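Entry for zinc ion complex. Fields follow.
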Amino acid sequence: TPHALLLISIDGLRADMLDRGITPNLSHLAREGVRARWMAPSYPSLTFPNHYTLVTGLRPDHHGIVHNSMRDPTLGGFWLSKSEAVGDARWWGGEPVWVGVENTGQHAATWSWPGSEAAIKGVRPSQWRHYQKGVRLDTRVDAVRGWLATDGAQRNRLVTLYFEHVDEAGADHGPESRQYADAVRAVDAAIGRLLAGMQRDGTRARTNIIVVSDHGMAEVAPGHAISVEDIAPPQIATAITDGQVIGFEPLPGQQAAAEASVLGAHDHYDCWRKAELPARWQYGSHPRIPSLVCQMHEGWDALFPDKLAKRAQRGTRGSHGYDPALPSMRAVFLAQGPDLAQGKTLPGFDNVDVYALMSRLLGIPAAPNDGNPATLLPALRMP
Ligand SMILES: [Zn+2]
């Protein structure tokens, strides 16, 4: 029979965090279900590009959400809080799973998944919301609980759930901090209450569940921040993004200065013309990508000079956006329910492979994607 699918993201949950005895509910779920050793993000290892990859099966270079902050010659500027860029379907390539679900005449309900605020290929989820900071754990958990309990023609085949809490604590104090651990416990306990609730609604047993994160987290120790203008001064190029994936557009008639001073290897970063980026990143062909892309080494940030003055307090902090082959960047994948195996472990794999699993659990035809449809067949009860 057709079963519902609950898709949960715990933003910035690193893969080793399942094995520290701070996720009793997730650990139990994995033991009853399937667990990957880890799941690698796509390049760049950032929140928006990876949440969108997860639901499309496409690499960021194909789906168009190539950074958290971008420019396009036609659509203008995009960043996470410009709601009318985020809510504009023209940024978002491919076909996310909720579109596919709606196009079968079934219903999708999304708690704040990146892209779910837009009418992608003209199609919205049945239930959704604009992202709001500070929404309570038990608020979103009860909404999702209700969307899963919904009967009749309003029945949801797909429900998605997002938590920011782990990522926020990690950004502030680093991934080895007690604040990061507390946020993990808290999100884990929230999921426990969700599961218990589903047991009481009688929705648990007919619901498949996938829990993922978008990327992991690396520690950024005091003094590990430079200015983007140390990479290329404003005389020669414009920094389009800061953080860890630093995009530059040289000034007109400054190619040579830009390329002579920026390209290649430096103390704590490396830079490439976008077309010449490391092949395994599968990134650099999209026109929205700045002509020059620099990658900061793990544990280092390059910041706009105004931020650099503001922050420089002290305090261990945390960042993602590093090389997706780094252990620190590893995300989680686990799954459990009536159509998923039990007590199974899977090898490490790339996050573009989740899409094909979800298509099959949702009874939708899989759109074309960058994933390998074989990788997650073993997660199924019956391949
Ligand atoms: Zn994130």
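NOTE: The longest helix spans residues 178-201.
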